[PDB]
Design a protein around this nucleic acid. Sequence first.
RNA 1: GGUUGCGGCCAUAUCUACCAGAAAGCACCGUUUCCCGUCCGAUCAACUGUAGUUAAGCUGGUAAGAGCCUGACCGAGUAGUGUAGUGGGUGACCAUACGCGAAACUCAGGUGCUGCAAUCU
RNA 2: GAGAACAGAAAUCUCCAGUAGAACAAAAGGGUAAAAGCCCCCUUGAUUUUGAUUUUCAGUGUGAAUACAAACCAUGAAAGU
Lengths: 268, 504, 171, 194, 270, 65
Amino acid sequence: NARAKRALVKREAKLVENVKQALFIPGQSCNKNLHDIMVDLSALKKPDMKRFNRKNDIHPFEDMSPLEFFSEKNDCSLMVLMTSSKKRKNNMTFIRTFGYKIYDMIELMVADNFKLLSDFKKLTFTVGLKPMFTFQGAAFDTHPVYKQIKSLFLDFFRGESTDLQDVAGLQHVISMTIQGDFQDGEPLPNVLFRVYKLKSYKSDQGGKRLPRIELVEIGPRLDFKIGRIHTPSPDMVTEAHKKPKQLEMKTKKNVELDIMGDKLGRIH
Amino acid sequence: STLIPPPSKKQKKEAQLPREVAIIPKDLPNVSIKFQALDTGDNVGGALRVPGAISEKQLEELLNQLNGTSDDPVPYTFSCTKTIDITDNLYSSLIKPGYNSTEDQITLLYTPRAVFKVKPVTRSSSAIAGHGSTILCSAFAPHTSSRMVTGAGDNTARIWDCDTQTPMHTLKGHYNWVLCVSWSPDGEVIATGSMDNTIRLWDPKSGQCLGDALRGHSKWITSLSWEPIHLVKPGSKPRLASSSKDGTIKIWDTVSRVCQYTMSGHTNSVSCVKWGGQGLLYSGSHDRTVRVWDINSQGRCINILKSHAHWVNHLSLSTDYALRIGAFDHTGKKPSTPEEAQKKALENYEKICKKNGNSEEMMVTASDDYTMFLWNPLKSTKPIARMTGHQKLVNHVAFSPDGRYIVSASFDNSIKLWDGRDGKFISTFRGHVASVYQVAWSSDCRLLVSCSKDTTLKVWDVRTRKLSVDLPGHKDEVYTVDWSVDGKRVCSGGKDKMVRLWTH
Amino acid sequence: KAQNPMRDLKIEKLVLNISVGESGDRLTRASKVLEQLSGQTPVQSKARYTVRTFGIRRNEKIAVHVTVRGPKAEEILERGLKVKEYQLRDRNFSATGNFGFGIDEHIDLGIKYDPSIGIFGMDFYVVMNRPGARVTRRKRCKGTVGNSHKTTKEDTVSWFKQKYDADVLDK
Amino acid sequence: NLPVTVEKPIPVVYDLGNLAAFDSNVLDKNDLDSSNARREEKIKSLTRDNVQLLINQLLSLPMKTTTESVGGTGGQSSVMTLLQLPDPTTDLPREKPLPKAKAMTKWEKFAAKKGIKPKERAGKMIYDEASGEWVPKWGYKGANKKLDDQWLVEVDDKVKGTDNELIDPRTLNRAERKRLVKKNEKQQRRNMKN
Amino acid sequence: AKSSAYSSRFQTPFRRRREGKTDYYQRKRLVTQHKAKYNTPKYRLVVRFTNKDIICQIISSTITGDVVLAAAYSHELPRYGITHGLTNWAAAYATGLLIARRTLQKLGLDEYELTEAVEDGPRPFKVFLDIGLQRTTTGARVFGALKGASDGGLYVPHSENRFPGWDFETEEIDPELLRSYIFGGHVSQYMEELADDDEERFSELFKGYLADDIDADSLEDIYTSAHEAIRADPAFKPTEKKFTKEQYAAESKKYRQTKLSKEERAARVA
Amino acid sequence: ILAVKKNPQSPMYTQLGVLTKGTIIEVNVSELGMVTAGGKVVWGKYAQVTNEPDRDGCVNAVLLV
RNA sequence: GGUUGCGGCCAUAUCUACCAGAAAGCACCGUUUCCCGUCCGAUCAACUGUAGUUAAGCUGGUAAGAGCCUGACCGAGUAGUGUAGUGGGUGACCAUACGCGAAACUCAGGUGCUGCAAUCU
RNA sequence: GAGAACAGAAAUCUCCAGUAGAACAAAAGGGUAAAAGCCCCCUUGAUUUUGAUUUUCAGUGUGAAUACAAACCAUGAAAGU
């Protein structure tokens, strides 16, 4: 009973949130290619990851209730549905939920020119360290769709936040790049998802404090074509982006805290 | 727990502002420098122009070339005159703050340093039991870091194996507290001076007592000293000097197990006796005086130094590390012959004594008048310098192994760092909250360890003059601390009856 | 295969069980007779349900048992066989190569009767196994026994006939 | 000795809290299309440039150093030097709404009206004067349940004239205690419904 | 008689749980759990005992499978001078010392990473002890290997209540008995008692000691020389492989059974 | 004196800061040089007042260790 | 290519009956002074690898076995479901263009791939 | 399912099979099996105490509650919880 209450308190809301957990759900149609790509993505997400095994007849753009059911049961705010069809081959649906209700959904398809984690056969990063991110393309900062993609992937692979970082834990970078620039009224370019491992060398030009960085590809290399979009409502956006303000000291005019910790007031 | 203040909203915003990268410009013009030695002040090469992005190792290679030792380089350090050390490159060290323009010449002072590097001790390797009373004294073997000797108040000494952190031998000859222990500078015999006015010698390999005790002191032994190896002629063993509360210094021949001289000038308790490298003995007593005796002249008092207004508590010689180490090194190699041992010990002693023209052996005396006096007794009988600044008695004083710094541990919970040549004040190490009992150097003179009444050890970095690592773990007051010759282990002991071994 | 010396049947254990029903001084006497019969301290039994007819409540003491392994088990087994004059039924042997029998009075085994102790019986049970039987009991890589290697009822009957040369009564 | 200084027409913006770098420069699809043989090298080179700039910023961050030894609470030892990451700049949706405040209960409003300050809660031990012991005032072995184990109770004269004369006073006290507890639970349920 | 419903509903464990040798409840806390959130990588000192070998490995978990950093086995003890008793407490201590010294030499701690750009001197190497499905008992050879690694120089966090000589009443250690156990004092005492009491048991057990003419008083000396040799030259020499890989493969496939084709299977059916 | 922790007469006298016999106070112990097992410096502990300052004009306390 | 330690995917890996396993490793196996734990040295703990064995353990192979898995240009862009041009029709209801879109059934198949280290007649 | 004297359909002991078909909270459309079930060891501190930080009560606001955090505390070989 006490363990049950502890689980309930873990499930309940808080001012400073936990790491978002991700649930990988196979659909009614599944393939080995989907299984291998899901395994790679779950290895990138882990250990904030859970995976289903049985098939579920789920259609995100027709109904949301089974997805909300799984989210509320598993305490998972991120969902990845793997499905297949003639119109949507290797279709991965990324779902973000807010308060066990659907916040937003993006639907991507993986192109055939993809390589798994086992293809490269190179040394990879240690389990459970937060990655670096790179986002190539002005549409990530301007366009609504690529803004949604950037926010989703930052939220998905960000992991636990910290104010202190051990430098030895900086190994791998996730790169999301736009396949060429575009203009209005055209097909939307695909997003390329690459994973690199860092190597450092003495530069002899930036001193001993600045090294030369080089990259070695780990995988998976994925090419996402943007199939379908489901944006959140503005009121839902404001509700999801409300900050607590209970934890920070309130700003007071002409009142400061000096280095010694004395509260001081300035007069004029 | 009391915490530092949190950053404000403005400070968080400025932290979020993008950072600037300290980069080296590529068109940075060449700058004129003049090399000069710290100890001798010799200008080598004149004013030569070097690239502004020059590194420490490339500058060191250039200096070795100009001095003509490119085949056999010795790593040095560079300072600028406010004395600022050159860390990474000349541009970042001096030009980047802009204190000196490029067109102006820079006088770079080069100081030789130690080739090997000693890692700071960071953790308690083990807490070893075995003593039944408070631990009073400790020393490492001069040749190896695997053998340690500790004397305690249960009338026993103990030889500890530092490799497994387990006891190896128990020495139970004495009848009272074993006040002092000392290892022979050739690493063959352990001398223990006790509260029962006796000195006992031990074979450490077998853990045995050599014959009977040396007798003749009417009061408890306060300090022990060994005759230097480089003065000892080959085929013979060093003599042992002992001091006691009765005010005498007795010299013992261990080969024949007799007493040769009993110097008797002092009127109160002799605090300490140190056997120097020019055939002299320096004795400090509670009669506010330091006596210089000559062993070559049948044990007569040559000099009386009178400048202290209270008890002298400790003294330290510049060559004390070399004299204690003998012919051994930070590699701990055992010489093939006593001849080669004597020659190597002589060279090791000379590398610190004879420099900057003539050989000198500075002495420093720490007293109960809250001060220290720096002397050069070979050349002058008046004090070279007076070091003041401590608020309580200076309990412990130590010269750095290369003889360039003096560290003074006081009862005002502070340590102070002074120049070892002229005795000017450099810095104050703070962080002990109780009286600092004694202190110890590393072999490469970059790290210092201090034990306190506050049941803690502390490791300090000399170059940055700041606390490196605080080591708790002792349950009670810590009385003795030592650092190994190779710099691999630190031993400590006190009222908790536990010998603590600390490593990196 | 059969001629390999690792297929010989040995004694796994001899378990002596005394089920008295009501806890008390008689149960203590049963513990004493088991302890002095074996040289080891016996272990009591806890109740599993409650029945009014048995007069057994919840979480009580009902029985004791002793497990004996080795030459002592051989000694007690052969004393029991001497009391039973070397005749066992076909039905006593269970299908997994294990067999037991009841002794009604402990006096016939040779232990001296005493006034305060009383009269007690016991259930002998003997477990047989071939070498390699510790696999299902070890902590790491607990694995199942071979199909040919498992002890059988015919095999324990044949080993009994070879060992004690005592006939096995069908009826 | 390849350089570490990367030139870009449009400066890269940084979110050092999330360890992210965003570059919005012109990307040509001729070199990133699937029909090109140099697409992987192009992507790797641009990622290398962006990661190099990000690493330069991270090594330009201020650093925290400590002096405590290993084996204690904290996870930072003296030999380790950590980077101080600023607060993340990018705003991301939360997974759940913020905890709304509990509405003021009937008791809390009554205390606000009548000037009742909340109690100190120094502890749960009380001194039982008839003995020489400090005992808990409630809970396991609490002093509120001593009447049930008291050896002798005098029957109150008010119980005469009623049908409750014959019942155990300890039983009556236990029933009264349970009635009070269940009433407290009912009041909590009512405050919950409001 | 397992029914088809049972065969359909059966939910198999992991492979390593099926062949029970791995504790996943323990491994999840060893790998994915962190004291702080600084993304500091962790390493495991896995210590394992067979019936004739003691194995120590230093492993870091990776997303494609965990990787060995440095390994040491007790069949290398004859190189350092131990020819008998390769699975005892003293052998475990020597193996822990060997793996520590080898690791320190490989990492260069005792005679360009991104950490060298921020810190002046290298950190001590911190590892966490992995014991697997072995009992934690006072005076176990796994804790002997732990003591050996700690003395060799790897920072392995531990308490000392499982070392031999730990008194259960007074929370303190018996360092003399600990040293004796390090140098095989219990083995030598058993040997001397055997020689005094049961001559046949003394002839059977410790037969190699007589065959190589090894006294009971030289165990401490040979363990000391082994530790000195280990500290002197801890680098790993591969065993000189007499044959080649393709020869090994060919002679192995000579005895390994060959598959039969599907048409041949239809032939044997028909 | 750092604070008044517990005046045994009444919590009202505690919040008024009354120093009578038996009052628990918080004292600054910085000059005693105490260190915790974790290396932290103790600078605040508790003491009990052992006299009557209204009668003798001074506060006497014994440290609670 | 066999094997051992540590893993990923967690049945193509599981369950049942058979035979093969040169060497090494693994295991069974011998002892109970010592550290240690039980009713019981069975499990656990310790010592020797000294007496033996590939019988079990473990690996492989065998079966119109059970179970399980993968491709389909196979159903099929089908059933099913939502718009609609005033599409007829006072009527239950039906072709039509745009979207979203299964499974049953059929063919082809199979009963482990692997990462790091060490060792191998 | 086989057996073991009183002891049979239910008292106690042994072997084999046993995806949980038992028992914990909950109402999964996938909760828990070297456990989240059963037994044992250690802890009785759990209403600790510090805070320039959030919220509230004045005539006693450097006080108390309250939120959050940290130092600790418990346990374990340890990772950790």
